[PDB]
Amino acid sequence: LTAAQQQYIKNLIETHITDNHPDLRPKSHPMDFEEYTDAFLRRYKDHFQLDVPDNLTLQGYLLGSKLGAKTYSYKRNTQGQHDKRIHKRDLANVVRRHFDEHSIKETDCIPQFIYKVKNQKKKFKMEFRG
Amino acid sequence: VYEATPFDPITVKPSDKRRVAYFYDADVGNYAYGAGHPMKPHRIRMAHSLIMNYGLYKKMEIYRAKPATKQEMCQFHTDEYIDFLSRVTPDNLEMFKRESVKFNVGDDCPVFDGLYEYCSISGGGSMEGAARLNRGKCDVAVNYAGGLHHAKKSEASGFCYLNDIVLGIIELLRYHPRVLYIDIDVHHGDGVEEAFYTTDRVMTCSFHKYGEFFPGTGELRDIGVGAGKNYAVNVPLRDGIDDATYRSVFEPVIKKIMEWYQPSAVVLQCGGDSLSGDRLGCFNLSMEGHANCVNYVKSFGIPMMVVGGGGYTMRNVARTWCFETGLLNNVVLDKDLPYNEYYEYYGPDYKLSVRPSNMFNVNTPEYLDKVMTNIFANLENTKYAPSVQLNHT
Amino acid sequence: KEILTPILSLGDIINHKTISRTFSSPILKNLALQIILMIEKEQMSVVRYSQFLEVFLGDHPEPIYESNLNLPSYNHNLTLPEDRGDPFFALPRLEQSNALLSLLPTAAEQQQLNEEIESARQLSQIALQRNKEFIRNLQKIRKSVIKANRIRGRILNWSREYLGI
Amino acid sequence: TIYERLLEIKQMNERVTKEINTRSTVTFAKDLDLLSSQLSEMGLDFVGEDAYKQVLRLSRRLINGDLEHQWFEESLRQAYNNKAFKLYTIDKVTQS
Amino acid sequence: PANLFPGLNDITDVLEEFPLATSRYLTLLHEIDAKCVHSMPNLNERIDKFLKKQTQVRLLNNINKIYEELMPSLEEKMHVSSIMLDNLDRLTSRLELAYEVAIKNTEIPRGLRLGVDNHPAMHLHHELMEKIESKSNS
Amino acid sequence: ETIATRTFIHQDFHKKVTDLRARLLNRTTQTWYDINKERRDMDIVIPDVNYHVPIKLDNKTLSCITGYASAAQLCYPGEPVAEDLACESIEYRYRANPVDK
Amino acid sequence: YSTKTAPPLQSLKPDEVTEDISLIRELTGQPPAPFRL
Amino acid sequence: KRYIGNKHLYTEFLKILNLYSQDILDLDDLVEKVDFYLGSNKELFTWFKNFVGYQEKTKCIENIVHEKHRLDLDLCEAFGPSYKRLPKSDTFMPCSGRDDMCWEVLNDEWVGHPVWASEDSGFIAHRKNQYEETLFKIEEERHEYDFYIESNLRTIQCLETIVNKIENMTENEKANFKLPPGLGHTSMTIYKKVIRKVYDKERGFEIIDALHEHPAVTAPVVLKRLKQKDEEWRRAQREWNKVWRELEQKVFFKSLDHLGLTFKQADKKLLTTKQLISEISSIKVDQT
Ligand SMILES: [K+]
Ligand SMILES: [K+]
Ligand SMILES: [Zn+2]
């Protein structure tokens, strides 16, 4: 009731109370690879045969605390092993770098796209790298 | 075709044992319709407590089932209805004043925080119970968060917003020819009956109170249209019916249905507004009288899917659900409740009992004889043709 | 000359005497029944094979209760005495399937038993996947049949209402 | 009219007495002192002598006018939960 | 132009052909079954016995014996099911084209299919929504 | 209560793992048989013919030869379908009145 | 008699709420809130 | 190529399309990521979606043709006592997740209509006492307390795990921490309603925001308020437990007496000479 808090509260409710249209759901940038389901990341890393470990999902990353440090997951992911998973940000940065450096020129990117789209329902078709 | 008898001690038979899969989700109790509404999910949580503290969890397997998805809801409901459910909140209701008017929303079925999540939990539990029953894992599958049997394919009706039993029976029908549904609420199971009215693969059987009541449907002469004629059984009853009366009406109807319809997957709604002391129902059933139904439907030996329903006095639903669940495990419990976090709500003597009153029974040997004879007559056009080899159901 | 000729209008689905014998047949509905009745028996089989394979894969298809997970008991400072006024985070240690531990009470007999246990796993896997493909086919078939029956019934209804019947 | 009511009570007598005589208490309710004893601070509980003789004796005390109606009713409720309301006026029928 | 009703005529032909195809394959399946009726019962018996049990070695031997005795007849079933499926998919595509051309033509009038306008009911709806929009304007 | 929910946690884990493995096995053996069928379907040299409702073609049956009508112009897989058609269950091609009179 | 009714569960006072909101804003790095204590 | 204009962002666009064709992306996330390049043009986008084979799983509300109708079921053809035939146009309501047997088995044209019936019995209407109506209020208040408290007790559990983890991490991990909606667990609704219960129904929004963006600053601070109100509310609850337990022990037994409570006056009124005569049924008086 002081001509500042009024519009403050007004903006708050005008920004948090809407009709939840699916047309307003906040969508992430295409270049930020951390917002990619962590199975896209693993399939990318596994397809281009990169050299990274797998990531810690979110349950394995909050599982790290003095109390959480006694669970089988911590003691299987933090001792001396080779399967030692990592934080999603690291794998996502490796993937992003191999994305911005390895490059492509069309004349083979498009016809492959068309052959892919026109055969979605087919089980027996050209695997474009496998 | 009805002789009244005394009510015999409920007792588990040792020749058959089950593999109970119990479904619970620690979130469900956390939703509330509003200030004074008679619907309280908290009671499901309360029942869980007794199951834990009686030592009953040690003979069954307790699972959280994943919530049901929008496109699993639209197997029975419309897109506009489900989209409304997903987008409406107690804060933006002013921008849905048409849809709220159009989908039967606002006084008997309000919108609370967590409506869509509560519906997801109910539907998920029901469909996962059905799927696990199809895969030959469990024999009985219990889901007390589901049984919202009053919901319409395009409308909210009677404290219910999503018909999870329809989804459950749709999943049960992928592998089964013939499914029976029993509804022992005090209201008529009208959503499920309206949904499966013109088919012969689901037989609905309601035992309700017909009068100046809710919803207003389910007469003795409402028996199915089309190819579904004679595949909808109604038993209308009057106030005051008690354990002996109810048992003598309930057993022969169900036994004749089992002999004729030969179904081989039963769904059982175990609503609790049909108990003495409830705040909306008007029967005079005990806890043993309400549990002998479960015991009888179990004594047959075909895949059962038990669900919740009504019950508006929390204490009594909690106690009768815990007792029924003990009976499905071949266990007659003890009457003294163990200490639990709800060691209130159970005044005044803290026991495993539901007590009947002395109110008067308005149902007499001629009304019931007439009703049951009409039913036994309607219920002989529903057999299987003589050349049709079965799988011993 | 009347038998042998085309529909001339919608009312001919009930008026014509040959064409009515088709749109009122109780035959697309008995086929679907036979199909589901064989699907049910084949699913009984699929279920009885799918647990042999799980006894031989290591999984325990038996129900695992509180007394089968031989979890190590712990102790915090609860359960006070009268009137006075980690092994928590450990893993089940599941013993073995009783079907598998009932086999064990030479070397030749042991390699014999090894080959038997190998054959069991591979045969059960083949049989299971074949029955599952059978069922998937049967379901596609029944879907086509009931689609035809529904179209038939809609035509019958529109016809009998066109006549005012 | 009076005879028939007394007859139904004397038909329920056996089960009622051997039900009130085998009553158990729930231990945690005893230790947390949750129960009440109003109908035992007054002797209105139906301890192991018969229940018919007690309802008779209490009817007499009610007639003499020392035992209030409220407590006769409450004792009858708790000993005969839904089965002896047809005695609440055993003093006004005799009087007539 | 005229209307020779080709949709409904092809639909009649289709619906007459549908049940003849299926029954040959159903009899083929019944013929395959008749070998597996002294093998499947005792196999199911021995499997449930071994599941709920010095002799277990002989039992597992018997179970593998019966398994690979009964293996050949399980490929017959799915071969027959596959040819049955292809036949019925041909019939289904036939049916669906006939149906859609019946509806796209007027062998079923579009006032008889999608109902009437203003339908003596539905005055309740107009009242309700009219009031909503009116006091929305108020 | 904490002992009971410990048991519940471990039982739920066991359930989800065994589902995982059975589902992956079923998916691979599905893909195998689909590969088999799509392989043999490339071996047919002469397909089957069937009846249907004659449609208007490019340089063919009768309405495009004599200058009477247009062609049928097949539509795309996935497109605006009318809702009534989506109820009559469906599979809709041929944007507008295919038949040749 | 009877007629005894439990009073409603209460929440934080506007001043305790104002102190938490400005402290969270200060630790993070946003400008000052419009209501100060 | 003409619309996107620049060649660098067009190159990145083509690389995402190739990411689809190389069997790494999925169809839905493909269209989702294409949004940022083909959003402002609708016809390109819908041609693309038809091209790729893209179908939505359910329809929105803003584009549906065959709505729900508040129709007065008085003017509709009846069958039996309760059911009425729907108009035809209200049977084309879209149910986008139905398969073929979901059309074989389900019923689409008959609706139910409630008939208000008057009962055959000549009797008094059973009702509720006042003793049965004190219990319902006692249980309403018990439930209100249990609801708020046990809903606080779950946000406590979540924020507790998160604080235990925050206390075991460095400073760059403190400036590089973020939590998704749902805070890492199954539910996405309960913690927000808790937070606006405890704080404010309007300023809890900012707290939930800073809880999603800055979990390391914002949620050891929130957890110390939930723990305060937990103890306040449990204090009040175990105080009123004895009040309710006292008010219950009388009306409980006086609450299952449906007949007696008025059987006093009833036996006074049905022992008169009039009724004692009238029961003989061969004498006649006159029917009331
Ligand atoms: K019912
Ligand atoms: K039915
Ligand atoms: Zn009910």
CSV table of N, CA, C and O in Angstrom, one decimal, chain B residues 204-284:
chain,number,residue,atom,x,y,z
B,204,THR,N,-21.3,-55.7,-14.6
B,204,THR,CA,-21.3,-54.9,-13.4
B,204,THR,C,-22.4,-55.3,-12.5
B,204,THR,O,-23.5,-55.7,-12.9
B,205,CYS,N,-22.1,-55.4,-11.2
B,205,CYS,CA,-23.1,-55.8,-10.2
B,205,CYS,C,-23.0,-54.9,-9.0
B,205,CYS,O,-22.0,-54.9,-8.2
B,206,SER,N,-24.1,-54.1,-8.8
B,206,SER,CA,-24.1,-53.1,-7.7
B,206,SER,C,-25.1,-53.5,-6.6
B,206,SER,O,-26.1,-54.1,-6.9
B,207,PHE,N,-24.7,-53.3,-5.3
B,207,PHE,CA,-25.6,-53.4,-4.2
B,207,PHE,C,-25.7,-52.1,-3.5
B,207,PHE,O,-24.9,-51.7,-2.8
B,208,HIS,N,-26.8,-51.3,-3.8
B,208,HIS,CA,-26.9,-50.0,-3.4
B,208,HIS,C,-28.2,-49.7,-2.7
B,208,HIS,O,-29.0,-50.5,-2.6
B,209,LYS,N,-28.3,-48.4,-2.3
B,209,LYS,CA,-29.6,-48.0,-1.7
B,209,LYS,C,-30.3,-47.0,-2.7
B,209,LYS,O,-29.8,-46.0,-3.1
B,210,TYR,N,-31.5,-47.4,-3.1
B,210,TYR,CA,-32.3,-46.7,-4.0
B,210,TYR,C,-33.5,-46.0,-3.3
B,210,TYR,O,-34.2,-46.6,-2.6
B,211,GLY,N,-33.6,-44.7,-3.6
B,211,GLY,CA,-34.5,-43.9,-2.9
B,211,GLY,C,-34.5,-42.4,-3.2
B,211,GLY,O,-34.5,-42.1,-4.4
B,212,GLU,N,-34.5,-41.5,-2.3
B,212,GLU,CA,-34.3,-40.1,-2.5
B,212,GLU,C,-32.8,-39.8,-2.3
B,212,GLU,O,-32.4,-39.0,-1.5
B,213,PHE,N,-32.0,-40.6,-3.0
B,213,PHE,CA,-30.5,-40.8,-2.7
B,213,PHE,C,-29.7,-40.2,-3.8
B,213,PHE,O,-30.2,-39.5,-4.7
B,214,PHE,N,-28.4,-40.6,-3.8
B,214,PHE,CA,-27.5,-40.3,-4.8
B,214,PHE,C,-26.9,-41.6,-5.4
B,214,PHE,O,-26.8,-42.6,-4.7
B,215,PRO,N,-26.7,-41.6,-6.8
B,215,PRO,CA,-26.8,-40.6,-7.8
B,215,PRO,C,-28.2,-40.4,-8.3
B,215,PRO,O,-28.5,-39.3,-8.9
B,216,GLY,N,-29.0,-41.4,-8.1
B,216,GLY,CA,-30.4,-41.4,-8.6
B,216,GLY,C,-30.7,-42.5,-9.6
B,216,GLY,O,-31.8,-42.5,-10.2
B,217,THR,N,-29.8,-43.4,-9.9
B,217,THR,CA,-29.9,-44.3,-11.0
B,217,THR,C,-29.9,-45.7,-10.4
B,217,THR,O,-29.8,-45.9,-9.2
B,218,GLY,N,-29.9,-46.7,-11.3
B,218,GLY,CA,-29.7,-48.1,-10.9
B,218,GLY,C,-30.9,-48.8,-10.3
B,218,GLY,O,-30.9,-49.2,-9.2
B,219,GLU,N,-32.0,-48.8,-11.1
B,219,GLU,CA,-33.2,-49.5,-10.7
B,219,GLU,C,-33.1,-51.0,-11.0
B,219,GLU,O,-32.1,-51.5,-11.5
B,220,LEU,N,-34.1,-51.8,-10.5
B,220,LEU,CA,-34.1,-53.2,-10.8
B,220,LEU,C,-34.4,-53.5,-12.2
B,220,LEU,O,-34.2,-54.7,-12.7
B,221,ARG,N,-34.9,-52.6,-13.0
B,221,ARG,CA,-35.3,-52.8,-14.4
B,221,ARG,C,-34.2,-52.2,-15.3
B,221,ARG,O,-34.5,-52.1,-16.5
B,222,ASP,N,-33.1,-51.7,-14.8
B,222,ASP,CA,-32.0,-51.2,-15.7
B,222,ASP,C,-31.0,-52.3,-15.8
B,222,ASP,O,-30.2,-52.5,-15.0
B,223,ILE,N,-31.1,-53.0,-17.0
B,223,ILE,CA,-30.3,-54.2,-17.1
B,223,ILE,C,-29.5,-54.3,-18.4
B,223,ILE,O,-29.1,-55.4,-18.8
B,224,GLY,N,-29.2,-53.2,-19.0
B,224,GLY,CA,-28.3,-53.2,-20.2
B,224,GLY,C,-29.1,-53.0,-21.5
B,224,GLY,O,-30.2,-53.4,-21.6
B,225,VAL,N,-28.5,-52.3,-22.4
B,225,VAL,CA,-29.0,-52.1,-23.7
B,225,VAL,C,-28.1,-52.7,-24.8
B,225,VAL,O,-26.9,-52.9,-24.6
B,226,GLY,N,-28.7,-53.0,-25.9
B,226,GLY,CA,-27.9,-53.6,-27.0
B,226,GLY,C,-27.5,-55.0,-26.8
B,226,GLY,O,-28.3,-55.8,-26.3
B,227,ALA,N,-26.3,-55.3,-27.1
B,227,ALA,CA,-25.7,-56.6,-26.8
B,227,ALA,C,-25.3,-56.7,-25.3
B,227,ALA,O,-24.9,-57.8,-24.9
B,228,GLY,N,-25.5,-55.7,-24.5
B,228,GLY,CA,-25.2,-55.7,-23.1
B,228,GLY,C,-26.4,-55.9,-22.3
B,228,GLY,O,-26.3,-55.8,-21.0
B,229,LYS,N,-27.5,-56.3,-22.9
B,229,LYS,CA,-28.8,-56.5,-22.1
B,229,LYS,C,-28.6,-57.8,-21.3
B,229,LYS,O,-28.2,-58.8,-21.8
B,230,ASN,N,-29.0,-57.7,-20.0
B,230,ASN,CA,-28.9,-58.6,-18.9
B,230,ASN,C,-27.4,-58.7,-18.4
B,230,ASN,O,-27.1,-59.6,-17.6
B,231,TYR,N,-26.6,-57.8,-18.7
B,231,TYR,CA,-25.2,-57.7,-18.2
B,231,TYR,C,-25.0,-56.5,-17.3
B,231,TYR,O,-24.0,-55.8,-17.4
B,232,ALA,N,-26.0,-56.2,-16.5
B,232,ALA,CA,-25.9,-55.1,-15.6
B,232,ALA,C,-26.9,-55.4,-14.5
B,232,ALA,O,-28.1,-55.4,-14.7
B,233,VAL,N,-26.4,-55.8,-13.3
B,233,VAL,CA,-27.2,-56.3,-12.2
B,233,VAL,C,-27.3,-55.2,-11.1
B,233,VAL,O,-26.2,-54.7,-10.7
B,234,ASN,N,-28.5,-54.8,-10.7
B,234,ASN,CA,-28.7,-53.9,-9.6
B,234,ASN,C,-29.5,-54.6,-8.5
B,234,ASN,O,-30.4,-55.3,-8.8
B,235,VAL,N,-29.0,-54.3,-7.3
B,235,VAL,CA,-29.8,-54.7,-6.1
B,235,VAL,C,-30.0,-53.5,-5.3
B,235,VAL,O,-29.2,-53.0,-4.5
B,236,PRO,N,-31.2,-52.9,-5.4
B,236,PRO,CA,-31.6,-51.7,-4.6
B,236,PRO,C,-32.1,-52.2,-3.2
B,236,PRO,O,-32.8,-53.2,-3.2
B,237,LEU,N,-31.7,-51.5,-2.2
B,237,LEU,CA,-32.1,-51.9,-0.8
B,237,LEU,C,-32.5,-50.6,-0.1
B,237,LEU,O,-32.4,-49.5,-0.5
B,238,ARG,N,-33.0,-50.9,1.1
B,238,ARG,CA,-33.6,-49.8,2.0
B,238,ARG,C,-32.7,-49.7,3.2
B,238,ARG,O,-31.8,-50.5,3.5
B,239,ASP,N,-33.0,-48.6,4.0
B,239,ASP,CA,-32.2,-48.3,5.2
B,239,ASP,C,-32.1,-49.5,6.1
B,239,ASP,O,-32.8,-50.4,6.1
B,240,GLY,N,-31.0,-49.4,7.0
B,240,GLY,CA,-31.0,-50.2,8.1
B,240,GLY,C,-30.5,-51.6,7.9
B,240,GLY,O,-30.4,-52.4,8.9
B,241,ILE,N,-30.2,-52.0,6.7
B,241,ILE,CA,-29.8,-53.4,6.4
B,241,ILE,C,-28.6,-53.8,7.3
B,241,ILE,O,-27.7,-52.9,7.4
B,242,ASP,N,-28.6,-54.9,7.9
B,242,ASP,CA,-27.5,-55.3,8.8
B,242,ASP,C,-26.8,-56.6,8.3
B,242,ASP,O,-27.1,-57.1,7.2
B,243,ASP,N,-26.0,-57.2,9.1
B,243,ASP,CA,-25.0,-58.2,8.6
B,243,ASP,C,-25.7,-59.4,8.1
B,243,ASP,O,-25.4,-59.9,7.1
B,244,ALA,N,-26.7,-59.9,8.9
B,244,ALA,CA,-27.3,-61.2,8.5
B,244,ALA,C,-28.1,-61.0,7.2
B,244,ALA,O,-28.0,-61.8,6.3
B,245,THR,N,-29.0,-60.0,7.2
B,245,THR,CA,-29.7,-59.6,6.0
B,245,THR,C,-28.8,-59.5,4.8
B,245,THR,O,-29.0,-60.1,3.7
B,246,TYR,N,-27.8,-58.6,4.9
B,246,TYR,CA,-26.9,-58.3,3.8
B,246,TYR,C,-26.2,-59.6,3.3
B,246,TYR,O,-26.0,-59.8,2.1
B,247,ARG,N,-25.7,-60.4,4.2
B,247,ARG,CA,-25.0,-61.6,3.8
B,247,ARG,C,-25.9,-62.6,3.1
B,247,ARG,O,-25.5,-63.2,2.1
B,248,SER,N,-27.2,-62.7,3.6
B,248,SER,CA,-28.1,-63.6,2.9
B,248,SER,C,-28.6,-63.1,1.5
B,248,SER,O,-29.0,-63.9,0.7
B,249,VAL,N,-28.5,-61.8,1.3
B,249,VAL,CA,-28.8,-61.3,0.0
B,249,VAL,C,-27.5,-61.4,-0.9
B,249,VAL,O,-27.6,-61.7,-2.1
B,250,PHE,N,-26.4,-61.1,-0.3
B,250,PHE,CA,-25.1,-60.9,-1.1
B,250,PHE,C,-24.6,-62.2,-1.6
B,250,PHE,O,-24.0,-62.3,-2.7
B,251,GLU,N,-24.7,-63.3,-0.8
B,251,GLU,CA,-24.0,-64.5,-1.2
B,251,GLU,C,-24.6,-65.2,-2.4
B,251,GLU,O,-23.9,-65.5,-3.4
B,252,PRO,N,-26.0,-65.4,-2.5
B,252,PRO,CA,-26.5,-66.1,-3.6
B,252,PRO,C,-26.5,-65.4,-4.9
B,252,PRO,O,-26.3,-66.0,-6.0
B,253,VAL,N,-26.6,-64.1,-4.9
B,253,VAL,CA,-26.5,-63.3,-6.1
B,253,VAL,C,-25.1,-63.5,-6.7
B,253,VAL,O,-24.9,-63.9,-7.9
B,254,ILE,N,-24.0,-63.3,-5.9
B,254,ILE,CA,-22.7,-63.5,-6.4
B,254,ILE,C,-22.4,-65.0,-6.8
B,254,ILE,O,-21.7,-65.2,-7.8
B,255,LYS,N,-23.0,-65.9,-6.1
B,255,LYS,CA,-22.7,-67.3,-6.5
B,255,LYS,C,-23.4,-67.7,-7.8
B,255,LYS,O,-22.8,-68.4,-8.6
B,256,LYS,N,-24.6,-67.2,-8.0
B,256,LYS,CA,-25.2,-67.5,-9.3
B,256,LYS,C,-24.5,-66.7,-10.5
B,256,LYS,O,-24.4,-67.3,-11.6
B,257,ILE,N,-24.0,-65.5,-10.2
B,257,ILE,CA,-23.2,-64.8,-11.2
B,257,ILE,C,-22.0,-65.7,-11.6
B,257,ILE,O,-21.6,-65.8,-12.7
B,258,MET,N,-21.3,-66.2,-10.6
B,258,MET,CA,-20.1,-67.0,-10.8
B,258,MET,C,-20.5,-68.3,-11.6
B,258,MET,O,-19.7,-68.7,-12.4
B,259,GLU,N,-21.6,-68.9,-11.3
B,259,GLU,CA,-21.9,-70.1,-12.0
B,259,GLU,C,-22.4,-69.9,-13.4
B,259,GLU,O,-22.1,-70.7,-14.3
B,260,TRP,N,-23.0,-68.7,-13.7
B,260,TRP,CA,-23.5,-68.5,-15.0
B,260,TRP,C,-22.6,-67.7,-15.9
B,260,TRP,O,-22.1,-68.1,-17.0
B,261,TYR,N,-22.2,-66.5,-15.4
B,261,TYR,CA,-21.3,-65.6,-16.2
B,261,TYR,C,-19.9,-66.2,-16.4
B,261,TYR,O,-19.3,-65.9,-17.4
B,262,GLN,N,-19.5,-67.0,-15.4
B,262,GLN,CA,-18.2,-67.6,-15.4
B,262,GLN,C,-17.1,-66.6,-15.7
B,262,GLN,O,-16.4,-66.8,-16.7
B,263,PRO,N,-16.9,-65.5,-14.9
B,263,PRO,CA,-15.9,-64.5,-15.2
B,263,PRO,C,-14.6,-65.0,-14.7
B,263,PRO,O,-14.6,-65.9,-13.9
B,264,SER,N,-13.5,-64.5,-15.2
B,264,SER,CA,-12.2,-65.0,-14.6
B,264,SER,C,-11.1,-64.0,-14.5
B,264,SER,O,-10.7,-63.5,-15.3
B,265,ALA,N,-11.6,-62.9,-13.7
B,265,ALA,CA,-10.9,-61.7,-13.2
B,265,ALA,C,-12.1,-60.9,-12.5
B,265,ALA,O,-12.9,-60.4,-13.3
B,266,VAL,N,-12.0,-60.7,-11.3
B,266,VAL,CA,-13.0,-59.9,-10.5
B,266,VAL,C,-12.3,-58.7,-10.0
B,266,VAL,O,-11.2,-58.7,-9.5
B,267,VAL,N,-13.0,-57.5,-10.2
B,267,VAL,CA,-12.6,-56.3,-9.5
B,267,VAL,C,-13.7,-56.1,-8.4
B,267,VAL,O,-14.8,-56.3,-8.6
B,268,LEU,N,-13.2,-55.6,-7.3
B,268,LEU,CA,-14.0,-55.5,-6.1
B,268,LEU,C,-13.8,-54.1,-5.5
B,268,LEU,O,-12.8,-53.7,-5.0
B,269,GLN,N,-14.9,-53.3,-5.5
B,269,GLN,CA,-14.9,-52.0,-4.8
B,269,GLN,C,-15.4,-52.2,-3.4
B,269,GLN,O,-16.4,-52.8,-3.2
B,270,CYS,N,-14.6,-51.7,-2.5
B,270,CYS,CA,-14.8,-51.9,-1.0
B,270,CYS,C,-15.1,-50.6,-0.3
B,270,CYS,O,-14.5,-50.4,0.7
B,271,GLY,N,-16.0,-49.8,-0.9
B,271,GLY,CA,-16.3,-48.5,-0.3
B,271,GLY,C,-16.7,-48.6,1.1
B,271,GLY,O,-17.2,-49.7,1.5
B,272,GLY,N,-16.6,-47.6,1.9
B,272,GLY,CA,-16.9,-47.6,3.3
B,272,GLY,C,-17.9,-46.6,3.8
B,272,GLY,O,-18.0,-46.4,5.0
B,273,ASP,N,-18.7,-46.0,2.9
B,273,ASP,CA,-19.9,-45.3,3.3
B,273,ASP,C,-21.1,-46.2,3.6
B,273,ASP,O,-22.1,-45.7,3.9
B,274,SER,N,-20.8,-47.5,3.5
B,274,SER,CA,-21.8,-48.5,3.9
B,274,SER,C,-21.6,-49.2,5.2
B,274,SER,O,-22.0,-50.3,5.4
B,275,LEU,N,-21.0,-48.4,6.1
B,275,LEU,CA,-20.8,-48.9,7.5
B,275,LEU,C,-21.6,-48.1,8.5
B,275,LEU,O,-22.0,-47.0,8.2
B,276,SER,N,-21.9,-48.7,9.6
B,276,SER,CA,-22.7,-48.1,10.7
B,276,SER,C,-21.9,-46.9,11.3
B,276,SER,O,-20.7,-47.1,11.7
B,277,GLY,N,-22.5,-45.8,11.3
B,277,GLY,CA,-21.8,-44.6,11.8
B,277,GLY,C,-21.2,-43.7,10.7
B,277,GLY,O,-20.7,-42.6,11.1
B,278,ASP,N,-21.2,-44.1,9.5
B,278,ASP,CA,-20.8,-43.2,8.4
B,278,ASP,C,-21.6,-42.0,8.3
B,278,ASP,O,-22.7,-41.9,8.9
B,279,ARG,N,-21.1,-40.9,7.7
B,279,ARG,CA,-21.7,-39.6,7.8
B,279,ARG,C,-22.5,-39.3,6.6
B,279,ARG,O,-23.2,-38.3,6.5
B,280,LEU,N,-22.5,-40.2,5.5
B,280,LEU,CA,-23.3,-40.0,4.4
B,280,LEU,C,-24.1,-41.2,4.0
B,280,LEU,O,-25.3,-41.1,3.6
B,281,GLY,N,-23.7,-42.4,4.3
B,281,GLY,CA,-24.4,-43.6,4.1
B,281,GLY,C,-25.4,-43.9,5.2
B,281,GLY,O,-25.5,-43.2,6.2
B,282,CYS,N,-26.3,-44.9,4.9
B,282,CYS,CA,-27.4,-45.2,5.8
B,282,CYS,C,-27.6,-46.7,6.1
B,282,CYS,O,-28.7,-47.1,6.4
B,283,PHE,N,-26.6,-47.5,5.9
B,283,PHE,CA,-26.7,-48.9,6.3
B,283,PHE,C,-26.2,-49.1,7.7
B,283,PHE,O,-25.9,-48.1,8.4
B,284,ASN,N,-26.3,-50.3,8.2
B,284,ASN,CA,-26.0,-50.6,9.6
B,284,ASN,C,-25.1,-51.9,9.6
B,284,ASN,O,-25.3,-52.8,10.3
